[PDB]
């Protein structure tokens, strides 16, 4: 019998999970749950689409609910809510609110007897695992995380909110020289501005002042003002034609030393044609883990830091020892 | 108070654990245990050196015993033995014997109520984790493991065994073109010979026939005969001067596709000035986990596949969430 998945929320991650389900034959997609009217949400798989108010009624039909909503306001509501009734996975990524989100989800899950794995994906998620591994294997050393080259939806939206901007796509770009210094084992001290450049392609509204748009981008707090930021004005057709993907990636590197001075470097990197597709593929592996954990009577909120890799696999622990441990 | 470590066996890994202890202030080295007479084993840290027959008597003095012996014959004896009395970590790496070793250590540990983690290091160990992560995140795709550039003690000893060879060092060398094809997402089908070259530096005995030495290297089953192998005859001084390190490294790469055809690539790589120092640093992180597990009443044999990354850290679960999960 297959592990029964539901999707909560049908954006990029929602479409991603749907696709990842096709690559995971031990799972089946029971339903997509949306806050929009189901009649207006066309899903690729033609499973049933339902409104979030019907989810509660599906409590015995679903093993794991993958929460695909945005971190800023969707998940703070939906994580604690769905964890009252289901085992859940989400991708929550707001640094400052992680202890608060964890607490709120854990209350709910503890209370219902369900497993909630929060903050799964590539960062947080895989990059987090590699930050941790780095510093426990090489306690004397330095960790560096680089993101990109890729599209940042958050920075793209920040530019779009500008009056006089009709649409935009921003790329986060690791600065090569900084990355090279890190990889060489120089253990550079690097500022914000020395690690990433920001590149912005922007479609002006009619009647906009480009100098003012450019200034508002470059002086924007929290998004652009600590970065060397470049702004290009282009047509809407060009933006569509050349800047429609959601590629991304990055590197986590630990450069350390043995106690006798040997230079040791660990590097974990990603090169993704689609960031949401990758993130969702990870969500689905983690759903397998949450299910195993629930079947064994576990409950409460977890992070990637709590989950042993063996639970992620449809293979038995014995076949894993045999096939992957060595050689 | 400090986690009490003992070392069983004082070779390269033994010296590595001793060094790694100095970078782990929550641990202390209680004793080195050797099969040699302790009077003949000079240890760097001047902790006490004891013979393995005194170990049993240290059962209440030691939290974890890191087993630093060789995999071919030392560990098959010492793993099951020490697991009768202590929580253990070892680096066992013999592919075909892993299920048997696991069974034998697990019987012993289950019996004593101790936690044994087998097959910890970089391969097996970290590379294994990354092979597994690869295929669960990207079920549709290909995994490739490359080793080197670095010294293989096994292949070096295999050469050294040849009559007419005084000493030797062998380098395992990933073939750049094969690696570039893998990175490109071409998903090449690669034979053994396509993946790695082997390079041999050899010191001839007096009166040797070099043609015969070279033939015996290049036609050696299991070590050389599926690889393009190069053999250089050099002096003993040159071997000592230029070939004394134990550098190593490698790459595990998963090249996969989303269900919509997006190319996704994960890569984990190591660049190690000292392979044994690195391996032992990992052993010590895993010792921390074995101890946590034992404190919670767990028992039996584990692999890296059973251990969540959070147990590796001296930080609390809360501080990990806060500090490493994002940003
Ligand atoms: N951890 C990681 O590595 C990682 C990586 C990538 C993303 N993420 C996180 O995942 C979150 C979700 O990303 P996303 O790209 O899926 O966001 P998204 O496309 O904006 O989707 C978010 C939510 O918005 C709603 N929505 C989607 N399309 C809509 C439309 N056309 N009109 C109205 N509402 C719509 C959906 O809810 P309803 O169906 O209910 O409307 C959906 O759940 C991000 O906020 C980010 O924090 C994490
Ligand atoms: N998982 C991984 O990634 C990984 C990486 C590297 C190595 N390893 C494994 O670890 C194993 C140990 O490697 P190692 O480099 O520590 O091997 P080693 O130097 O040969 O030491 C192995 C054992 O030999 C004995 N020994 C050491 N020096 C000696 C000497 N001068 N004379 C006589 N006996 C001596 C020691 O036992 P006594 O003190 O009792 O004599 C020691 O425990 C390897 O076989 C390999 O399988 C695993
Ligand atoms: O999916 S969410 O709508 O964000 C949470 C569930 N919705 C309700 C109504 O707000 C929570 O009370 C009931 O389904
Ligand atoms: O590109 S940046 O946004 O500056 C950094 C990475 N952020 C993401 C958010 O999901 C992954 O952590 C991708 O944009
Ligand atoms: O370190 S080992 O010696 O390989 C295992 C323990 N020793 C004995 C073998 O003489 C087990 O019988 C006795 O302590
Ligand atoms: O270099 S090779 O030996 O061909 C392959 C890797 N082996 C080691 C054995 O510890 C790591 O797996 C290092 O040589």
Q: Which bound ligand lies closest to the C-alpha atom of B81?
A: 5
Q: How far is it, in rounded angstroms, from Cα A245 to Cα A231?
A: 19
Q: Nearest CA to A289 among A270, A315, A307?
A: A307
Report the structure determination method.
X-ray
- Decide if B182 contacts B170 (C-beta within 8 A): no
Residue carrying the six token digits 């000079």: B42
For ligand 5, the distance from its centroid to the CA atom of residue B231, given in whole angstroms, is 40
Find chain B residues with C-beta within 8 A of A102's C-beta: 321
| Cα of A187 from ligand 4 centre, angstroms | 24
Q: What is the CATH number of domain A1-126+272-316?
A: 3.40.50.720
Mutate to test the interface with A, among B17, B20, B92, B326 (most CBs of A within 10 A): B326
* Residue showing tokens 């004891």: B50
Given phi > 0 = left and psi -120 to 50 = alpha, else beta, which region is A300?
A: left
**A202, β-bridge pairs:** A168, A233
Torsion angles phi and psi, residue B136, rounded to 5: -80, -40
- Known binder of ligand: residue A34? yes
Q: Is A237 in the pocket of ligand 3 (CB under 6 A)?
A: no
Q: Strand, coil or helix: what is B283?
A: helix
A65 forms beta bridges with: A6, A88
Using CA positions, which residue lies closest to atom 5 of ligand 5?
Answer: B78
By C-alpha distance, the chain A residue nearest B125 is A325
Give me the residue spans of the domains in chain A. 1-126+272-316, 130-269
Q: In what order do the strands lie in the sheet with B87-90?
A: B48-51, B27-34, B3-8, B64-67, B87-90, B115-117, B300-302
Residue B288: list chain A partners with CB under 8 A. Answer: 136
A320 touches chain B (CB under 8 A): yes
B310 touches chain A (CB under 8 A): yes
Question: Rounded distance, CA A9 to CA A82, Å?
Answer: 12
Whether residue A186 lies within 8 A of chain B, CB to CB, comes out as no
**CA distance readout (Å), B28 to A190, A205, A262, B15, B288:** 34, 66, 22, 14, 11
Give the closest residue (by CA) to ligand 4 atom 2: A152
Phi, psi at A83, each rounded to 5°: -75, -10
Q: How far is the CA of A110 from the centre of ligand 3 (A)?
A: 20
For an interface test with B, which of A21, A71, A133, A137 has the most B Cβ atoms less than 10 Å from its Cβ?
A: A137
Kind of pairing, strands A87-90 and A64-67?
parallel
Distances A270 to A72, A128, A147, A187, B158 between C-alpha atoms, Å: 25, 13, 9, 21, 37
Using CA atoms, how far residue B184 sits from A325, B200, B274, in Å, is 26, 30, 29
Q: Is B304 on the interface with A (CB under 8 A)?
A: yes
Cβ(A6)–Cβ(A86) under 8 Å?
Answer: yes
| CB-side neighbour CA atoms (13 Å) of B152 | 22
Query: Cα(A13) to centroid of ligand 4, in Å?
Result: 14
**Distance from Cα B299 to the centre of ligand 6, integer Å:** 30
Chain B hits for A273, Cβ within 8 Å: 258, 262-264
Tell me the nearest-neighbour CA distance from A275 into chain B, angstroms. Answer: 9
A152 lines ligand 4 (CB under 6 A): yes
Chain A contact present for B222, CB below 8 A: no
Q: A121 and chain B: CB distance < 8 Å anywhere? A: no
- Topology adopted by domain A130-269: Dihydrodipicolinate Reductase; domain 2 (3.30.360)
A198 has which bridge partners? Answer: A172, A229
Per CB-CB distance under 8 Å, the chain A contacts of B277 are 258-260, 262, 264
Closest Cβ–Cβ partner in B119, B258, B325 for A98: B325
Indicate whether residue B101 lines ligand 5 (CB < 6 A). Answer: no
Contact at 8 Å (CB) between A185 and A233? no
Residues A46 and A38: their CA atoms lie apart, in Å, by: 12
- Distance separating alpha carbons of residues B99 and B95, to the nearest angstrom: 9
Q: Decide if A10 contacts A34 (C-beta within 8 A).
A: yes
Other Cβ atoms closer than 10 A to B320: 20
Nearest-CA residue for ligand 1 atom 11 is: A70
CA distance B107 to chain A (A): 15
Put simply, whether B119 touches A (Cβ < 8 Å) is yes
Contact yes or no for A260/A140 (Cβ under 8 A):
no
Ligand 3 pocket residue status of A35, Cβ below 6 Å: yes
Ligand 2, atom 9, lies closest to the CA of: B91
- Mode of pairing for the β-strands spanning A263-272 and A248-257: antiparallel
Resolution in A: 2.1
Residue by residue, what is the 3-state secondary structure of chain A? CCEEEEEECCCHHHHHHHHHHCCCCCEEEEEEEECCCHHHCCCCCCCEEEEHHHHHHHCCCCCEEEECCCCCCHHHHHHHHHCCCCEEEECCCCHHHHHHHHHHHHHHHHHHCCEEECCCCECCEHHHHHHHHHHHHCCCEEEEEEECCEECHHHHHHHHCCCCEEEEEEEEEECHHHHHHHHCCCCCCCCHHHHEEEEEEEEECCCCCHHHHHHHHHCCCCCCCCCCEEEEECCHHHHHHHCCCECEEEEEEEEEECCCCCEEEEEEEEEECEHHHHHHHHHHHHHHHHHHHHHCCCCEEECHHHCCHHHHCCCCHHHHHHHCCCC
Subunit contact A23:B265, Cβ cutoff 8 A: no
> Is the CB of A195 within 6 Å of ligand 4?
no
Q: How many interface pairs between A and B have CB atoms less than 8 angstroms apart?
A: 226
Strand ranges, E, within B262-323: 263-272, 300-302
């Amino acid at each position: 019998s297959k592990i029964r998945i539901g999707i909560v929320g049908y954006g990029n991650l929602g479409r991603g999970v749907e696709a990842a389900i096709q690559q995971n034959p031990d799972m089946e997609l029971v339903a997509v749950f949306t806050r929009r009217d189901p009649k207006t949400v066309a899903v690729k798989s033609n499973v049933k689409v339902l409104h979030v108010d019907d989810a509660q009624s599906y409590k015995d039909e679903i093993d794991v609910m993958i929460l695909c909503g945005g971190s800023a306001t969707d998940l703070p509501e939906q994580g604690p809510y769905f964890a009252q009734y289901f085992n859940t996975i989400d991708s929550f990524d707001t640094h400052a609110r992680i202890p608060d989100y964890f607490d709120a989800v854990n209350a709910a899950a503890e209370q219902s007897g369900k497993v909630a794995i929060i903050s799964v994906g590539w960062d947080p998620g895989l990059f987090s695992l590699n930050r941790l591994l780095g510093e426990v294997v090489l306690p004397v050393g330095n960790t560096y995380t680089f993101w990109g080259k890729g599209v940042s939806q958050g920075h793209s939206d920040a530019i779009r909110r500008i009056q006089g901007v009709k649409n935009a796509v921003q790329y986060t770009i690791p600065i090569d020289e900084a990355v090279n210094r890190v990889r060489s084992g120089e253990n550079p001290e690097l500022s914000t501005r020395e690690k990433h450049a920001r590149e912005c392609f922007v479609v002006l509204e009619e009647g906009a002042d480009p100098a003012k748009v450019e200034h508002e981008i470059k002086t924007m707090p929290n998004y652009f003002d600590e970065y060397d930021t470049t702004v290009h004005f282009i047509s809407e057709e060009e933006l569509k034609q050349n800047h429609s993907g959601m590629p991304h990636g990055g590197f986590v590197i630990r450069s350390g030393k043995s106690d006798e001075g040997h230079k040791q470097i660990i590097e974990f990197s990603l090169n993704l044609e689609s960031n949401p597709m990758f993130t969702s593929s990870a969500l689905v592996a983690y759903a397998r883990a949450a299910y195993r954990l629930s079947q064994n009577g576990d409950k409460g909120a977890k992070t990637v830091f709590d989950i042993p890799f063996g639970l992620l696999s449809p293979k038995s622990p014995e076949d894993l020892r045999k096939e992957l441990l060595t050689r």
